[PDB]
Amino acid sequence: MLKLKVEGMTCNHCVMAVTKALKKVPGVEKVEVSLEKGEALVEGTADPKALVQAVEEEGYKAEVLA
């Protein structure tokens, strides 16, 4: 159970990109993002950098909060 801060392009379809881009790697599979806030929670054992880096590639901003 880890949480990722998400910032940047405050739009609806962006949520689709991050949930899919994160679960792309076999690992967590359970990834959720808040509709009202840029907060995301993940349930698995994947690395922090894997998530941070994966969302970074799209041009969006993020920060892991252990």
The CA distance from 49 to 11, in Å, is 24
- Crossing angle of the two packed helices 13-23 and 48-56, in degrees rounded to 10: 140
The CA distance from 14 to 36, in Å, is 13
Structural domains for the chain: 1-66 (3.30.70.100)
For this PDB entry, the determination method is NMR
Strand order in the sheet with 39-43: 30-33, 39-43, 2-7, 61-65
Strands (E), the chain: 2-7, 30-33, 39-43, 61-65
